[model samples]
Target: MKWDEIGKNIAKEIEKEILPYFGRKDKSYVVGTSPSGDETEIFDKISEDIALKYLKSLNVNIVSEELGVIDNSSEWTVVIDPIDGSFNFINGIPFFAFCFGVFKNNEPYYGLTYEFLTKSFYEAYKGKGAYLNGRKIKVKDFNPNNIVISYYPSKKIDLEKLRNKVKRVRIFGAFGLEMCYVAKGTLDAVFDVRPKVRAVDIASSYIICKEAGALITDENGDELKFDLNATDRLNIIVANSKEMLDIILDLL
Candidate 1:
């Protein structure tokens, strides 16, 4: 199946099967622990089941936040985070997302991040451009005077340094949506300095941001890579340009 078709189908299934559970206390109950060591809520489990069943139908291997790797031994891999911001969703914050990406021979081939609350889709295909709701999008040029960035707050790193360097700092909790904001120029950059981010969290947005002309790399400004496994974790930074990226890297 084509990447877009698969993405559309997943979006449809999630809307039908999972959207109804929003803000329902019963649906947010803890079900089990995911392979990534996060608590799997009822809604998260259902969403993952829906995505896994459909992707497995295509006979491709899958790396999922909830289930780890479903090995088909195929060169193609589908990485999925059925619900990116579980806490936000459970608490009715309305800022969660469904993120997935396709990899061929360990290289990004296709990616999509579906914003559940807004029903918006951010998608990208290899050698093609990134799109939001079918319209092409690109990152914004850095504005040193009005720089705004999204960051995941952690005591491990000093936030004061970044706060002093940028015009504004925001943390949206969902890494997938935050990265897409960078792709669309809504935010100049986004970064997670802790090694708590997983493949499922950034897989789709990685390609989306790149296709949209954003620069994404590790904390050391090196290329970022993730195996087809959920256990791998890393810190990431995405910026509009080398100038903006360098400023943040220096502050770190």
Candidate 2:
């Protein structure tokens, strides 16, 4: 199957298998620890299991938030975040998402992120543009006075500097969904430069934002890439335009 089709199918399978566990208090128990050192909830395990089985059947290489990396020795690598924002999901916050991206030789080929509560799909294929629920989407025009952004809060950076420059600031625990919001113009930009992001968190949204004409780069404003077989963490900035990105970078 084509990579996009595979991504859609994976989303379908994961949501179907995971929907029954929502709102179940017992499912919040910590089942184990993921390879990334995050505690795994029962729901997380269930969701990743469904995704892993389907991806393994296709014999593609896998890099998952829970399972780390599975080497099928294939050129195509599928990066999976079975449940981004698991804390919000388990707490009934209704903001988590299922995210996946297909890569060939470390280059993003196709990507999809399915918002669980809204049933919205953000998809992108290399050079084909991005779509939100079947409609083409793009970043908003840069508005300096009314700029809104999201970022991971840390003491290392001065929040006051950023807060003074932008109209509003938000911190949505779901990085994948927030990046898609940037693509659809709900947010002017989203940044996490403390080096807390993993490939699974931003892989799918990276291509989506790129296709939507957003400027996505590392904290240093360089092109972003990741090793498919390794869970390397890095900082990122996704902005509607270079002008807006420069403003944020300057504040940082």
Candidate 3:
């Protein structure tokens, strides 16, 4: 099957498989443990297992944060985030997404992230940029004239020191949503100096924002490559345009 055809079918399948879990969180359902020993949920384990069948059917392997790496089937790698915002999912806040992307020998081919609560789909192909529910979208020129949005906090980067530079702030607990927001031109930029978020929270967004023409790079102003395995911790930035990205990366 062509990749796009596969993408559409898998998106529909994933939505059906992953949605019911949102409303059925059990106290008995395991809230999980990251490599950092932070809390992770049972939802992560269940979702990855379900998504794997489709990716595997098409000869693709998967590397996700919660389930670690599953490499028994295909040469093409697929990064899956079974549940991107488990804390919110656990607490009964309906703001989580299932993020998955296909990687061909380490480069992104396509990515699809579904917001479970709202039923919105965000996807992208390498050359075509990003889309929201099939409507094409692109990152507009970032105007940091007003907002601060990301996982990094004051201790990581002196917020007070930069308060005078940028005017406001907002952090929704979900990283995938924030990155997609920037990709679709809804938010100016995103940066996370905090080490808590893993590869699952990022991989899908990395390509979505990248193809949308948003700036994605390391904190030190360098381009980034995919770590097929969720082994490394990340400290990085995303912006709607180059100007805002440079100012934020350089100043705060």
- Among the numbered candidates, top TM-score falls to 1
Query: How far out, in Å, is residue 51 in model 3?
Result: 1.4
Shift of residue 56 alpha carbon in model 3, Å: 3.2
Model 1 C-alpha lDDT per residue in residues 1-252, reported as the tens digit of each score: 688889878977987887777777665688899887888888888998999778978998898888889889898999999888888887778889999899998999999899988989999998999999999999997788999988874676666787888898777889988899999998999888877888889899899999999788788888765666888778888889888888767866
lDDT of 3 by residue, 1-252 (tens): 766566556556756765665556564365566553555566666666666767766656778776677786565788877777777776777777778787777778888887877777888988887888898888866555665555464365666655666666666778877788788886777777665556767888888888888787666777755477666777677777777777677665
Judging by lDDT, tell me the better candidate of 1 and 2.
1
Pairs of residues at least 3 apart in sequence or in different chains that clash in candidate 2: none
- Order of models, best lDDT first: 1, 2, 3
- TM per prediction: 0.96, 0.95, 0.86
Worst 10 residues of 3 by lDDT: 147-156
Candidate 1, lDDT over the whole model: 0.86
Every candidate's lDDT: 0.86, 0.84, 0.72
lDDT of 2 by residue, 82-115 (tens): 9989888787777889999888877889999999
Ranking by TM-score: 1, 2, 3
TM-score of 2: 0.95
Off by over 4 Å in 1: none
Candidate with top lDDT is 1
